[PDB]
Design a protein around this ligand. Structure first.
Ligand SMILES: [Ca+2]
Ligand SMILES: [Ca+2]
Ligand SMILES: [Ca+2]
Ligand SMILES: [Cl-]
Ligand code: NA
Ligand code: NA
Ligand code: NA
Lengths: 6, 472
């Protein structure tokens, strides 16, 4: 669901 | 005589120095007098604990902002599982205070350090742009340990506002010398991901940094691609040591891991280099990295020698950063000439891919024109193509000097039928070669399935100069 990840 | 730090965990920072030679040679730069004084680094992440006992003395509010909540204070949001610890760990690798009886030390332990709180919320194109373009006449170096998903099926990069922030940064930032953007190359190794399918690492405006384990091996999480420039140490298996840094709630950690830890170490080494020569441009800095990085004793099966005699790998780029060599070469470095760009549209008609396609083209590299290039920096092959299962494709590009770059390896999980829409695959492996002559593009189906598609555009884009070369 997230556009960018750590 | 230089006195090394006395911090209690400094003996555990195996990657900074030692008798063994498995280190980044950072103490050699400290002994030449460079510790980061006067340089400003910002961590774009989930916040920074600005009152941490090993960060407070170097903290710089002019290098900080909270984009998620729209205020100037980047303090992280505290939770039971300590979710927002990532940025604090990254900051301590760069600039943890030295000789204060607390934890260890940063690579650039006298530099000024800040943070942009921007991952703790929805990360839009606007959010990225405001972070990359923060205070660009004050911040020198930006470090980013995040990006698009590493599931091995995504193709994604900066949208319009973010790409505009990159061009504004390298053109007008740092007084016109250009912002320095440092990027972690990714954690998608277990998914067989390729870091050329990530537009942030694949960009010519970022220094993309990979990882090596303590015993000199390719870590399980590492992604291979041609856009990677160089490497720093990080974690590996459970017999190998890890990274020591500042942790959330004013604690110290010895178990920072992954691609996330490699970019901050590189940002620190670049901070030392800038102190040794403040007049270096964004392109100068990448030249220095190419000339001084070290392949020795990094294990890989794909080491190759390029057209100017340098060893290069898709796992490691030009090899491990060398801090002592960087600051030495920086001091009398002569600024490179302005960047030229030569555009060559290759195809006269579309071509069916089938089982295998090979496109050969002899180029003059803008001979006779103001953008004539005899000394290459980055090269791009911008491809438009349709295909029924994208991850079965493998793509290679061969330069006139004989250097074979892997633009795309097989991605087993990539089932997309969307193809590539003018995607700018980038290679660093032909740096300083003469690009005049025959180039070869190879596209092949690596599976036994009867796949089909068509290549409709291939633009070769060359960047570089026509002067100032060095003997190979
Ligand atoms: Ca805040
Ligand atoms: Ca300390
Ligand atoms: Ca990736
Ligand atoms: Cl351009
Ligand atoms: Na400029
Ligand atoms: Na890059
Ligand atoms: Na040639």
């Amino acid at each position: 669901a997230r556009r960018r990840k750590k | 005589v230089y006195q090394e730090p006395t911090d209690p965990k400094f003996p555990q920072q195996w990657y900074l120095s030692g008798v063994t030679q498995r280190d980044l040679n950072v103490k050699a730069a400290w002994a030449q007098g460079y510790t980061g004084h006067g340089i400003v680094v910002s961590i774009l992440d989930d916040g920074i604990e600005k009152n941490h006992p090993d960060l407070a003395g170097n903290y710089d509010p002019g290098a900080s902002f909270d984009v998620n909540d729209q205020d100037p204070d980047p303090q992280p949001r505290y939770t039971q599982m300590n979710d927002n610890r990532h940025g604090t760990r990254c900051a301590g690798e760069v600039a943890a205070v030295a000789n204060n009886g607390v934890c260890g030390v940063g690579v650039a332990y006298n530099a000024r350090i800040g943070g942009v709180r921007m991952l703790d919320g929805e990360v839009t194109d606007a959010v990225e742009a405001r972070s990359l373009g923060l205070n660009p006449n004050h911040i020198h170096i930006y470090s980013a340990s995040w990006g698009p998903e590493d599931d091995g099926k995504t193709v994604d990069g900066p949208a319009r506002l973010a790409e505009e922030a990159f061009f504004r940064g390298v053109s007008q930032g740092r007084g016109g010398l250009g912002s320095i953007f440092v990027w972690a190359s990714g954690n998608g190794g277990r998914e067989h991901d390729s870091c050329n399918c990530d537009g942030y690492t694949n960009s010519i405006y970022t220094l993309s940094i990979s990882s090596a384990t303590q015993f000199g091996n390719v870590p399980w999480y590492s992604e291979a691609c041609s856009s990677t420039l160089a490497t720093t140490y990080s974690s590996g298996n459970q017999n190998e040591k890890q990274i020591v840094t500042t942790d959330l709630r004013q604690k110290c950690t010895e178990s920072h891991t992954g691609t996330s830890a490699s970019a901050p170490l590189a940002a620190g080494i670049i901070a030392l280099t800038l102190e040794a020569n403040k007049n270096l441009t964004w392109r100068d800095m990448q030249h220095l990295v190419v000339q001084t990085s070290k392949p020795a004793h990094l294990n890989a099966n794909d080491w190759a020698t390029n057209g100017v005699g340098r060893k290069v790998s898709h796992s490691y780029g030009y090899g491990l950063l060398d801090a002592g060599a960087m600051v030495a070469l920086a001091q009398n470095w002569t600024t490179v000439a302005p960047q030229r760009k030569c555009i060559i549209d290759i195809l006269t008609e579309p071509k069916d891919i089938g089982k295998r396609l090979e496109v050969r083209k002899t180029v003059t590299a803008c001979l006779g024109e103001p953008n004539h290039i005899t000394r290459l920096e980055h090269a791009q092959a911008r491809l438009t193509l349709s295909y029924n299962r994208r991850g079965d494709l493998a793509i290679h590009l061969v330069s006139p000097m004989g250097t074979r770059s892997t633009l795309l390896a097989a991605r087993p999980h990539d089932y997309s039928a969307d193809g590539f829409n003018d995607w700018a695959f980038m290679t660093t492996h032909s740096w300083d070669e003469d690009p005049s002559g025959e180039w070869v593009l190879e596209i092949e189906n690596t599976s036994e399935a009867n796949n089909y598609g068509t290549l409709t555009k291939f633009t070769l884009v060359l960047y570089g100069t026509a002067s100032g070369s060095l003997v190979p």
